[PDB]
RNA sequence: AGGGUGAAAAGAACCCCCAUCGGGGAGUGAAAAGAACAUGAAACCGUAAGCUCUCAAGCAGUGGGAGGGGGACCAGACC
RNA sequence: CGGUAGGGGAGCGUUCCGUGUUAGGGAGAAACGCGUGCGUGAGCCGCGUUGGACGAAGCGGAAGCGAGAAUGUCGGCUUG
């Protein structure tokens, strides 16, 4: 309705005016008023606290990978064969388990240490063009490949406290 | 000048690389003690 | 002339806004000093620890570097340049990149006193061509010496620093002087670290 | 029948040339050169990544020799791995480099292990 | 809807017998230059050019004037481009039997003049504003209030565009 | 090069450049202002003054003198007759310029020269 | 002799910036010429 | 060699720039499709906005990606 | 399970015919432009503030059936 009237107002008249837009009833919520605050905190939104971890990483074997893990995160891995979505994990090479108070060094692995984390989705790879090519040998081999991939959440990091723990100790 | 140079393969026989010295030929890979045997990478929990 | 009109008032307190809001949400800078694994913060952001570490623009910034000081008095000319080198190439940090100067800076002092093996004060040539023909020119090392002898070691560092854009802005902070005395004092320079054995001449 | 080719050709060419989109000059314009350049592109595309993978074992391995350089005087890379085998760890390149700019405590802890165990 | 509608008159001319690149030689100069000054540049500049691209102009400023109804004084050259026309070839003997191409080029020429006072209201009471204080004023009004408030040459002159649609201020 | 070589080519050879010139100066006396191009007015000022200052002095011999360089007689008579009352008191200086809009067809760079 | 190649579209667009530059510096001229007869005091100048 | 304005010439009265051409309104028309008129690719010619080049050596890309910008909903991603 | 000359197997597309005066289509077809879609690829499937009347899929049939090279060839447009 002031859409559709500052819109005929600036057909019909042409050269538009703040007056008509803009009535003078509105003088603007004061810079130290609440009223100016609840705006302002609405379209400039502060940024907001961190979620909480624990302060936790391990370095885990997957796939003959070894992947640093800290927990709450999703990393992608490979395929992990006769595993579903919803899938509760638990991974059982722990090379080294960091807590900023301390950190276990296996030998070859942290004992009795497994890495709680479940399955949330099954993928293929980004499509990555294998391109086989010889000159003037008239031989060129144009060959897409889609690697299959799982995409993994860590949840928990547990059952290392009874291991020996090194510190550097000064 | 009675003598040539040596041109191309020639060349190349005669300058590639070569540890002519017997001990650096008869080394090998380290020898490490065999590991423990490791746990399963991944078992599924239900 | 800074026009303050209205409009580029406006204009300035703007960006200043935008700015605000990318630095609000933006992950802090947590610089290298017994930086822990992760802040809460980074750990909702994208994957560092699984990517090779890449320095962004905080850490390398020129004025946080480290100075240093070679005093050059019976050294031996190259095995010198080598430390050298590494140094200012950054290659002895844990950071180290080869696409980016995490280096040092590095005064030579003394630059006449340097000392050199064998015959070589005598034979070494340090030669340079015009560009017409006929137009190569060599100097022995010991006249260089009398007459500007910074350029033997600046040109005995340069040849081992890479070549190419970061080469030679590398080649920058190499900083050299002939006299016992440099007017860095302010850098506050620490001394150079030697390692090597041999780099120390005594008659 | 008679058959114009029709599209079936300049269908080939425009998703050729969405390839090719930001090379410079008339590498991205003329359909001839297009071809040429990506066959190129997809040619070091697969060149480099097996590059890849030989790099950052480069790199990695260069960051580790800086990063235990700097504690003992003697010590090095190689000496290190060969202590890091004989003591019985898995832990690859990637990982001990990451760790030495990440968590470098954790690098000096390790260190002090095999030196505790070697001792 | 857009600036293109309120500011701006659009003219053509069609098959001018300069070669697209002479007149390029003096549309480059006026380009962004107030209609009078404009004026007496073209009228004494030395090339041949300028004659009907003065012709053109003018003429753009009598329909600023007469159908959008614009203040002559406050026409801006805003956009200005030539584009190649209708070539006509023709071919002339040379020396030994060989021939020749002559090309005899034409050009459309477009310019575009824009007011400036034009949006002047919403202007300078939005510049007025400090970047708080304006956010905190659209904190009021209606969807339909916001649209035509800002719909000036406002959000791009101070490059506020993609800001704006950050800050949820809007809708696409 | 020409170091201190001052004459006025006109880009004509000296046979032509000479007849152009006692030309524009006869019609500059017969006209009493004429437009012309910036290099040929400069270059017809000499001429000019050698005319007037041939006037100045009447005698027979310059009368013949300026008879043998402008072409029309009557021009040259009545140059004589008035050029005593009018310029008598002006020592030097008799032709002012005033330069112009350039022309159209080549944009060569006009002017006025005028007998002041 | 000829061109042995054919130029690059980019260069071949700066050169022709640089002669359109003349137009600039011929514009300059224009206006402090026009300038000039806009007061009507110049007595070297003349117009009809 | 030169085909395809629209169903219908309804082929644009009148005003403005105005020596004509050409143009901008208004009017006709479902649409201006405006007579060089139907879909209208590429080369080629430009114009505007985002990032960026003036110590640089290079079949112009590719793997790594500093710094800057943009449209998101799986905001850790894409461009 | 590298691969030229070269041989063999398995496919994709183009225009047309059969089914068919088909399904669908001025509630927008062909085409043109786009894609965080799917393919080993040829390509397919989805989408359009373009376009203005046609025309798939399936199961089959036929060829003026796929272009970057021929000092090819015809138009268009550059460079100098
Ligand atoms: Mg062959
Ligand atoms: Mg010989
Ligand atoms: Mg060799
Ligand atoms: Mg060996
Ligand atoms: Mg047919
Ligand atoms: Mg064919
Ligand atoms: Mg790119
Ligand atoms: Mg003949
Ligand atoms: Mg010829
Ligand atoms: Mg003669
Ligand atoms: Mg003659
Ligand atoms: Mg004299
Ligand atoms: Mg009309
Ligand atoms: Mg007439
Ligand atoms: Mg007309
Ligand atoms: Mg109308
Ligand atoms: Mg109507
Ligand atoms: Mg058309
Ligand atoms: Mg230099
Ligand atoms: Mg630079
Ligand atoms: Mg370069
Ligand atoms: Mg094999
Ligand atoms: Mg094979
Ligand atoms: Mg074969
Ligand atoms: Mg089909
Ligand atoms: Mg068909
Ligand atoms: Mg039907
Ligand atoms: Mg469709
Ligand atoms: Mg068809
Ligand atoms: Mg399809
Ligand atoms: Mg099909
Ligand atoms: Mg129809
Ligand atoms: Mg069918
Ligand atoms: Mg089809
Ligand atoms: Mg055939
Ligand atoms: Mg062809
Ligand atoms: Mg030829
Ligand atoms: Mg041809």
Redesign the pocket.
């Known amino acids: 309705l002031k859409a559709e009237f500052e819109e005929f107002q600036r057909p019909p008249n042409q050269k538009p005016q703040l007056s008509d837009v803009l009535p003078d009833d509105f003088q603007a919520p004061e810079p130290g008023t609440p009223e100016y605050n609840d705006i302002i905190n609405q379209f400039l939104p502060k940024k907001g606290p961190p979620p909480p971890r624990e302060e936790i990483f391990a370095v885990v074997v997957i796939g003959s990978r070894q992947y640093i893990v800290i927990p709450?995160?999703?990393?992608?891995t490979q395929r992990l064969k006769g595993a579903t979505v919803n899938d509760k994990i638990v991974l059982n090479k722990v090379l080294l388990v960091g807590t900023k108070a301390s950190t276990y060094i296996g030998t070859p692995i942290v004992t009795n240490a497994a890495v709680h984390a479940v399955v949330?989705?099954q993928l293929?790879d980004?499509?990555v063009?294998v391109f086989?090519y010889?000159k003037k040998?008239?031989?060129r081999?144009?060959?897409?490949?889609?690697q299959p991939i799982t995409?993994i959440?860590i949840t928990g990091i547990t059952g290392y406290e009874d291991y020996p723990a090194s510190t550097l100790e000064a | 000048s009675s003598r040539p140079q040596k041109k191309g393969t020639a060349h190349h026989m005669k300058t590639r690389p070569k540890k002519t010295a017997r001990w650096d030929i008869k080394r090998g890979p380290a020898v490490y003690p065999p590991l423990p045997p490791l746990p399963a990478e991944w078992t599924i929990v239900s | 002339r800074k026009s303050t009109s209205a409009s580029t008032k406006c204009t300035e307190e703007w960006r200043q806004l935008?700015?605000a809001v990318?630095k609000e949400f933006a992950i802090p800078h947590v610089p290298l000093d017994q930086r822990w694994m992760f802040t809460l913060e980074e750990a909702?952001?994208?994957?560092i620890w699984?990517?090779?570490w890449?320095?962004?623009?905080?850490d390398?910034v020129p004025t946080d570097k480290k100075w240093y000081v070679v005093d050059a008095t019976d050294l031996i000319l190259g095995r010198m340049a080598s430390t050298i080198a590494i140094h200012i190439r950054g290659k002895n940090l844990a950071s180290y990149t080869?696409?980016?100067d995490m280096g040092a800076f590095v005064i030579v002092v003394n630059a006449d006193k340097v000392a050199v093996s064998g015959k070589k004060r005598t034979q070494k040539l340090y030669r340079r061509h015009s560009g017409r023909p006929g137009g190569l020119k060599e100097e022995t090392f010991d006249q260089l010496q009398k007459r500007i002898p910074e350029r033997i070691i600046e040109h005995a560092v340069r040849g081992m620093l890479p070549k190419?854009?970061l080469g030679?802005?590398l080649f920058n902070h190499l900083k050299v002087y002939k006299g016992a005395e440099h007017p860095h004092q302010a850098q506050q320079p620490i001394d150079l670290p030697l390692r090597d054995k041999r780099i120390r001449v005594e008659k | 029948?008679?058959?114009?080719?029709?599209?079936?050709?300049?269908?080939?060419?425009?998703?050729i040339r969405?390839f090719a989109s930001?090379?410079?000059?008339?590498?991205?314009?003329?359909?001839?050169?297009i071809?040429?350049?990506k066959?190129?592109?997809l040619v070091?595309?697969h060149?480099?990544?097996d590059?890849?993978k030989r790099?950052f074992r480069r790199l990695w391995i260069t960051r580790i020799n800086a990063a235990i350089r700097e504690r003992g005087v003697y010590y090095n890379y190689s000496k290190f791995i060969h202590d890091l085998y004989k003591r019985q760890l898995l832990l690859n390149r990637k990982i001990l480099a990451q760790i030495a700019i990440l968590n470098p405590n954790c690098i000096y802890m390790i260190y002090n292990e095999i030196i505790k165990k070697e001792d | 809807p857009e600036p293109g509608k309120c500011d701006e008159?659009?003219?053509?001319?069609?098959?001018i017998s300069m070669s697209?690149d002479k007149a390029?030689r003096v549309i480059?100069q006026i380009?962004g230059r107030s209609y009078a000054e404009t004026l007496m540049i073209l009228e004494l500049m030395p090339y041949r050019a300028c004659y009907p691209i003065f012709?053109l102009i003018?003429?753009?400023?009598?329909?600023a004037?007469?159908?959008?109804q614009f203040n002559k004084a406050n026409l801006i050259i805003s956009?200005?481009?030539?584009?190649?026309?209708?070539?006509l070839?023709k071919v002339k003997p040379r020396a030994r039997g060989r021939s020749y191409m002559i090309?005899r080029?034409?050009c459309h020429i477009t310019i575009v003049l824009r007011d400036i006072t034009h949006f002047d209201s919403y202007d300078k009471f939005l510049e007025s504003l400090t970047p708080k204080k304006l956010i905190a004023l659209l904190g009021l009004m209606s969807t339909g209030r916001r649209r035509e408030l800002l719909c000036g040459r406002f959000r791009?002159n101070h490059?506020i565009?993609?800001?704006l649609?950050?800050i949820a201020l809007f809708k696409? | 090069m020409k170091h201190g070589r001052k004459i006025h080519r006109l880009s004509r050879p000296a046979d032509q450049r000479r007849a152009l010139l006692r030309g524009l100066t006869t019609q500059l006396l017969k006209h009493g202002r004429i437009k012309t191009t910036r290099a040929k007015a400069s270059a017809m000022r000499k001429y000019v003054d050698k005319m007037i200052t041939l006037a100045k002095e009447g005698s027979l011999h310059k009368r013949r003198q300026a008879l043998g360089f402008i072409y029309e007689k009557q021009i040259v008579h009545a140059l004589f007759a008035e050029v005593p009352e009018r310029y008598g008191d002006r020592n030097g200086g008799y032709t002012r310029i005033i330069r112009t809009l350039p022309r159209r067809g080549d944009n060569a760079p006009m002017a006025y020269i005028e007998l002041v | 002799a000829?061109?042995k190649?054919?130029?690059s579209?980019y260069?071949?667009?700066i050169?022709?910036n640089i002669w359109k530059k003349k137009g600039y510096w011929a514009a300059l001229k224009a206006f402090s010429l026009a300038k000039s007869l806009s007061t009507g005091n110049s007595k070297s100048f003349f117009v009809r």
Request: a positive charge; zero cysteines.
């Open positions: 709450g995160r999703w990393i992608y949330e989705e293929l980004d499509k063009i086989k010889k040998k008239n031989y081999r144009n060959i897409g490949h889609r995409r959440k | 935008k700015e990318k909702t952001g994208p994957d699984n990517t090779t890449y320095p962004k623009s905080a390398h080869p696409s980016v190419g854009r030679r802005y | 029948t008679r058959v114009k080719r029709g599209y079936i050709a300049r269908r080939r060419r425009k998703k969405f930001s090379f410079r000059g008339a590498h991205s314009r003329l359909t001839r050169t071809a040429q350049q066959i190129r592109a070091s595309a060149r480099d990544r590059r890849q790099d | 008159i659009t003219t053509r001319g069609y098959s697209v390029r480059d380009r012709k003018y003429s753009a400023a009598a329909n004037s007469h159908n959008k956009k200005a481009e030539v584009n190649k026309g209708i070539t070839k090309k080029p034409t791009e490059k565009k993609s800001f649609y950050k696409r | 000829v061109p190649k054919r130029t579209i260069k071949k667009r050169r022709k």
